[PDB]
């Protein structure tokens, strides 16, 4: 807003998987306050991820996010009679936020039957660099690397 930056909220570690990255994942899956339901989806998907790799699934999940973190996004501006995008460097806390929105966001429209197995398959494909959430990592980068000429419009 006008008067400076706003405070951000702290997250407590998940009791099963000792990671801040998992409790930030269950908040993206959360709808309508159903947080015990959103925890059974995320726990049921990460335990379906060690039934196919054997490795502890927060190691899979940190590899799945490092393939869907963007580094250059495409914020817009109107200059004169024409409007065109300006590439900007993404600060590191937005990168985890925008990546976890893409995993949960594209797993709601995969073709399996339940949300547990849709979220499980999206983590395994993103860990290998395969799924649709990885495709928006480079569609963000292609649109940012086709507008290098507009990088002097840093506001």
Partner 1 sequence: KKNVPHGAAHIKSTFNNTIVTITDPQGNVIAWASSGHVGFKGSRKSTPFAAQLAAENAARKAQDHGVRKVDVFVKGPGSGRETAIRSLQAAGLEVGAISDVTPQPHNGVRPPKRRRV
Considering the complex, what minimum distance in angstroms separates the CB of residue 82 from partner 1? 8
Quote the CA–CA distance of 112 and 40 in Å, as a whole number: 17
From 48, 53, 73, 76, select the one nearest 63 (Cα to Cα): 53
Q: Which does 8 bind (CB under 5 to 8 A by kind): partner 1, RNA, none?
A: none
Q: 7 or 54: whose CB is closer to RNA? A: 7
Q: Which of 49, 94, 47 has the alpha carbon at shortest distance from 71? A: 94
The yes or no reply on residue 152 touching partner 1 (CB under 8 A) is: yes
Cβ closer to partner 1: 43 or 150? 150
Nearer to partner 1, 37 or 88 (CB): 88
Query: Residues binding RNA: what is the number (CB under 7 A)?
Result: 11
One residue of 86, 98, 115, 123 binding RNA per CB under 7 A: 98
Beta partners for 72? 89
Contact 89, 71 (CB under 8 A): yes
Residue reference for tokens 């899979």: 60
Q: Which residues bind partner 1 (CB under 8 A)?
A: 148-152
């Amino acid at each position: 807003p006008r008067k400076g930056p706003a405070p951000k909220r702290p997250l407590v570690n998940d009791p099963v998987y000792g990671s801040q990255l998992v409790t930030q994942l269950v908040n993206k899956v959360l709808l309508k306050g159903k947080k015990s339901l959103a925890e059974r989806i995320v726990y049921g998907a990460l335990e379906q991820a060690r039934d196919k790799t054997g490795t502890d699934p927060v190691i899979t999940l940190k590899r799945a996010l490092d393939n869907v973190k963007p580094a250059l996004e495409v914020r817009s501006r109107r200059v004169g009679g024409a409007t065109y995008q300006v590439p900007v460097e993404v600060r590191p806390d937005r990168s985890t936020t925008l990546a976890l929105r893409w995993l949960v966001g594209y797993s709601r429209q995969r073709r399996e039957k339940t949300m547990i197995e849709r979220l499980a398959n999206e983590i395994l494909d993103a860990s290998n660099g395969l799924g649709a959430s990885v495709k928006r990592r480079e569609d963000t980068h292609k649109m940012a690397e086709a507008n290098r000429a507009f990088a002097h419009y840093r506001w």
